[PDB]
Amino acid sequence: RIASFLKNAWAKEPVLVASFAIGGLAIILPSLSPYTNYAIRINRATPYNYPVP
């Protein structure tokens, strides 16, 4: 039945619905992506400061 009032809210306040959708998905998703480990890694690679010998 809990699925049913999604039809209701989707009928009633769609804006807010899409909002919760992507709003939560943006939190759950990122851990899943492998590229994240590269993503931090890239910022290890670039050296604003000099590499002292």
């Binding site: 890239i42 690679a45 670039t46 050296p47 604003y48 000099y50 590499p51």
Partner: protein
């Protein structure tokens, strides 16, 4: 027309967007890091120059 088509076209536009932006952005990260090697190669003699110039001005003003 149909409502599903609206979301479909929209979301497809998004993903193509993210994709191209990803490619170009990464590439620009590469040319950046290479530019950092460029400056990082230039640096030491500038260090030398600023060095001698400082000691110079300090001597002169001392006189």
């Amino acid at each position: 027309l149909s409502g599903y088509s609206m979301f479909a076209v929209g979301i497809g536009t998004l993903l193509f967007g993210y994709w191209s932006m990803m490619k170009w952005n990464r590439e620009r990260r590469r040319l950046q890091i290479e530019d950092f090697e460029a400056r990082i190669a230039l640096m030491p003699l500038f260090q030398a120059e600023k060095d001698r110039r400082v000691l110079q001005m300090l001597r002169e003003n001392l006189e």
